[PDB]
């Protein structure tokens, strides 16, 4: 669905690839509907026995996929509202979204296992869902965000990539301008932009090594982090500026220098979020009909 978004925004698309993609879209949708819950979650579940559970991060993913489904095709709003009540039920006494582990393989989850980070991602997903920045759910989320924010700022270390990326993303979509200029400053100080060389990472060795060879369970999120922050970077409701957008273009250059073109990547997370980036950046950088000009 996100490459359908891509092509529908590129202005490149055909009705036949459209037809087949609709077929596969409906197929995936109905297959997912087979996997629906009694209560409205989604997981790898043995339900029809009352003592069973759902999943959190997976359910964030299914909710965003249903968002795109509504963006293209038919989908039941009762289901998304069921998902969101389940979200509300799944929060703590006063904290935010815990991590209810019932998954087969933890390779897919690109996170720091922290309830606050789960909460942040789901809640910015729900910020894409139409509601306020002051909803009780986003509000308690924002509480967790601010806590994480202080721990990361005045802490010298905050996982250095993941929590800070999702936090910049979240508080960026909250409505924060100059604080996100501040995280821009912090991150560009933690940068490896070179005058005559293109590359984007630190020495890549982790702090808590599992396996130590090939970095098991760690996708390394190389283009993924930069893509997240750039996604946050492009956005301004009335019109973004010239500095932010030209810097966005040049980092798009550096990241397409750092991405490949074989079609698909070694994972799904960095893939879908790079796809977000390419789609909306192409929609933004140009029109769809203005095609005649002599500069």
């Amino acid at each position: 669905i996100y490459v359908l978004d891509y092509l529908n925004e590129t202005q490149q698309l055909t009705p036949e690839i459209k037809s087949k993609a609709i077929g596969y879209l409906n197929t995936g949708y109905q297959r997912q509907l087979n996997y629906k819950h009694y209560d409205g979650s989604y997981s790898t579940f043995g339900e029809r026995y009352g003592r069973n559970q759902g999943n959190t991060w997976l359910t964030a993913f299914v909710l965003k996929t249903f968002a795109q489904a509504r963006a293209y095709i038919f989908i039941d709003e009762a289901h998304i509202t069921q998902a969101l009540i389940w979200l509300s039920q799944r929060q703590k006494d006063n904290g935010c979204f815990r991590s209810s582990g019932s998954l087969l393989n933890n390779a897919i989850k690109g996170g720091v296992e922290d309830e606050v980070t789960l909460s942040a991602y789901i809640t910015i997903a729900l910020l894409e869902i139409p509601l306020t920045v002051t909803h009780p759910v986003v509000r308690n989320a924002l509480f967790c965000l601010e806590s994480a924010w202080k721990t990361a700022q005045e802490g010298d270390h905050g996982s250095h990539v993941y929590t800070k990326a999702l936090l910049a993303y979240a508080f960026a979509l909250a409505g924060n301008q100059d604080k996100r200029k501040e995280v821009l400053k912090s991150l560009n100080e933690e940068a490896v932009k070179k005058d005559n060389s293109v590359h984007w990472e630190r020495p890549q060795k982790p702090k808590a090594p599992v396996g130590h060879f090939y970095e098991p369970q760690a996708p390394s999120a190389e283009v993924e982090m930069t893509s997240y922050v750039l996604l946050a970077y492009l956005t301004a409701q009335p019109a973004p500026t010239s500095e932010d957008l030209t810097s966005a273009t040049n980092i798009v250059k550096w990241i397409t220098k750092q991405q490949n073109a074989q079609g698909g990547f070694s994972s799904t997370q960095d893939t879908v979020v790079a796809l977000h980036a390419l789609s909306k950046y192409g929609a933004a950088t140009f029109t769809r009909t203005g095609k005649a000009a002599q500069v």
Binding site: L84, I85, Q89, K92, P136
Partner: protein
């Protein structure tokens, strides 16, 4: 020094365009804080924001009024916000809705009509609150026998709480009964059948006796019948009463015999008097292998040659047990900090306790095994002292259960009815629990029960406070009606149970009756205990028929008088009970009204919404236990106060310890002026301040019983459904 503890009895079903109730409370130090219950939609936003302010020991439980909503079905947040001076608290939920309807019944003029007649019919309109109801209806029609709308009237301004129209029937008899259906703006269809048939009455009917229940040890049965005719007149006649066994041994699927033994019984009845007959069972084969038992009767007459029939007891079925005993006062919950006790009723077979049957009280996993016997009522009041395991089964049996009275049964079974129960004690880690002793029996009305409930402070008070009070409840109607409280200062470490409560059952109370009482601790601990009470329908608004008796001077000035108010109207119905004698009635009662009630009990939760989840399990929980004993950290499954909430259907919000800290499992997992009959009167009526001063058209010599339907509707008070009465 107590942290402010706050607790609310607030139902999780928010309605649309009506009024219901929920309660609240606080305690402990300081009460100069505002609270605010903001009912908001879970999707979108429907602002119904409740701000509240009061003090401690103040449960001001008031009926809220909900306006109509937007959609059909959805749940809705309710963030309650509690602002401590040292901390800040809030909590939200998902309050669910339910598409409601007005409530209805159609009052049938008759069930027999000839070609060319006109049906007369009424209706009902009402809501959960049984104040009378005025509403439009987009949809009305009687129905054909084939499924065709008949009698339509669109969005009509029912002003009287119920409209009655009529419909002219055909002079073309298309034989069969008919039907009506109705829906409101929302479009929920509901229907009311009504027999409409026709044939000459068999001018009398047979009235016969029979054993009620049948069981194993059976040799002879009884019959007795008396002659009848119009006005209750006697008759002689003759009978040939085939009464049969059925279900012959074959596969009997029409390739074989299906009729088993038939036994005909004849006799004669005197002119004035009755006649008796006796029958047996062995000739009918009370065999172990059979299907159900049908027991039908008949009577023929003299000097005209006519028969009338009755089909009785189509399944006089012998049990796979022999007794008919049961519990009377049996509980599912208790504590090891209380020796509970109860009563059991022994009855055998037909509904009879006979004394002198010694039995055995058998408490397994209680280490309690006592005997008793049958009093004249077969009642035994056991009692169990209890310092035993969490859950336990309970049974008291006459016949010894080493080997299953009939010796094993690796084949078909037959045993004494064994009254069995399994009760689970209440989780109370402090053991300072709240105990009540329900009086589970034939519940009366117009009373106030002295239920002795018991209050346990194990661990007592350490810093705490002296003044203490609790808040017991006087509720019904599937909602929230009335409440009270009790106040009792606390000693340091006394835990007496000697306490009784007054719980009146006078008025505005339905057959539904559950209460709660509870007690809070400033240590972050609160305790509550509810019980249900099998209240019968004692009327809330008075309605009581009283009529001009069997009375000469049969002129219309015969002033029946049912009780009603100065502020009401009433739906009056003169009717002869002829066809409704020929066949019995069909719940023509407020029983039908009460079972009509959707969600009459505020209990349960739909599938999709489940509960709000919390975090309590421990991360590293291994044995870690030494000293006098060494023990793991395994578990126990027992009831919670959270479970009492989910029981009651109400929600609540507190910063305290309620949800037990259940651990979390690993993933390693498994030329005469006669007048028209059967309606002297048909009209809604406005009661004066002295009931109904009546002048209804009356006639002599109608040798008939005349039900008087009169069902009144008070604005200041509510509905009214009277018992009718025969007129002569």
């Amino acid at each position: 020094s107590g942290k402010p503890q706050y607790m609310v009895l607030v139902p999780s079903l928010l309605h649309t365009e009506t009024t219901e109730k929920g309660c609240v409370l606080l305690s402990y130090l300081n009460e100069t804080v505002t609270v605010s219950a903001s009912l908001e939609s879970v999707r979108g936003n429907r602002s119904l924001f409740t701000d509240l302010e009061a003090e401690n020991d103040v449960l001001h439980c008031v009926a809220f009024a909900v306006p109509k909503s937007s959609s059909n079905e959805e749940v809705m947040f309710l963030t309650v916000q509690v602002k401590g001076p040292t901390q800040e608290f809030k909590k939200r939920t998902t309050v669910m809705v339910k598409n409601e309807d007005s409530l209805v019944f159609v009052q049938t003029d008759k069930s027999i009509y000839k070609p060319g007649q006109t049906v007369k019919f009424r209706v009902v309109s009402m809501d959960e609150n049984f104040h009378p109801l005025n509403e439009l209806i987009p949809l009305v029609y009687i129905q054909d026998p084939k499924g065709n709308r008949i009698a339509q009237w669109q969005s009509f301004q029912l002003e009287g709480g119920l409209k009655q129209f009529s419909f002219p029937l055909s002079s073309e008899p298309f034989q069969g009964s008919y039907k009506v259906v109705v829906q409101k703006k929302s479009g929920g269809r509901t229907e009311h059948p009504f027999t409409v048939e026709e044939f000459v009455l068999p001018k009398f009917e047979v009235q016969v006796t029979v054993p009620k229940i049948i069981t194993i040890l059976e040799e002879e049965m009884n019959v007795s019948v008396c002659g009848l005719y119009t006005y209750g007149k006697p008759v002689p006649g003759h009978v040939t009463v085939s009464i049969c066994r059925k279900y012959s041994d074959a596969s009997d699927c029409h390739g074989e015999d299906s009729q088993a033994f038939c036994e005909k019984f004849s006799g004669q009845l005197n002119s004035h008097g009755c006649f008796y007959q006796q029958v047996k069972t062995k000739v009918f084969q009370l065999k172990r292998k059979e299907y159900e038992m049908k027991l039908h009767t008949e009577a023929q007459i003299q000097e005209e040659g006519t028969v009338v029939e009755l089909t009785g007891r189509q399944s006089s079925e012998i049990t796979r047990t022999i007794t008919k005993l049961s519990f009377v006062k049996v509980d599912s919950h208790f504590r090891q900090g209380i020796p509970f006790f109860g009563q059991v009723r022994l009855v055998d077979g037909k509904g009879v306790p006979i004394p002198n049957k010694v039995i055995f009280i058998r408490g397994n996993e209680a280490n309690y095994y006592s005997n008793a016997t049958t009093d004249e009522h077969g009642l035994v009041q056991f009692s169990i002292n209890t310092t035993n395991v969490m859950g336990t089964s309970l049974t008291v049996r006459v016949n010894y259960k080493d080997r299953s009275p009939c010796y094993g049964y690796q084949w078909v079974s037959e045993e004494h009815e064994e009254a069995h129960h399994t009760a689970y004690l209440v989780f109370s880690p402090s053991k300072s629990f709240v105990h009540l002793e329900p009086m589970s029996h034939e519940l009366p009305c117009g009373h106030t029960q002295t239920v002795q409930a018991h209050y346990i402070l194990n661990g007592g008070t350490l810093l705490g406070l002296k003044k203490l009070s609790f808040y017991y409840l006087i509720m019904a109607k599937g909602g929230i009606v009335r409440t009270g409280t009790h106040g009792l200062l606390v000693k340091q470490e006394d835990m007496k149970g000697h306490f009784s409560i007054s719980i009146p059952v006078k008025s505005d109370i339905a057959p539904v009756a559950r209460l709660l009482i509870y007690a809070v601790l400033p240590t972050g601990d609160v305790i509550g205990d509810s019980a249900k009470y099998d209240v019968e329908n004692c009327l809330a608004n008075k309605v009581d028929l009283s009529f001009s008796p069997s009375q000469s001077l049969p002129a219309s000035h015969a002033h029946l008088r049912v009780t009603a108010a100065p502020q009401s109207v009433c739906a009056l119905r003169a009717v002869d009970q002829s066809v409704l004698l020929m066949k019995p009635d069909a719940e023509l009662s407020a029983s039908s009204v009460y079972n009509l009630l959707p969600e009459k009990d505020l209990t349960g939760f739909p599938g999709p919404l489940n509960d709000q989840d919390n975090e309590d399990c421990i991360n590293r929980h291994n044995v870690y236990i030494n000293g006098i004993t060494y023990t793991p950290v395994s578990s126990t499954n027992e009831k919670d106060m959270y479970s009492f909430l989910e029981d009651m259907g109400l929600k609540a919000f507190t910063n305290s310890k309620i949800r037990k800290p259940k651990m979390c499992p690993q993933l390693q997992q498994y030329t005469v002026r006669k007048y028209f009959p059967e309606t002297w009167i048909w009209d809604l009526v406005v009661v004066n301040s002295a009931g109904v001063a009546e002048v209804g058209v009356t006639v002599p010599d109608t040798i008939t019983e005349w039900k008087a339907g009169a069902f009144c509707l008070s604005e200041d008070a509510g509905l009214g459904i009277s018992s009718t009465a025969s007129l002569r």
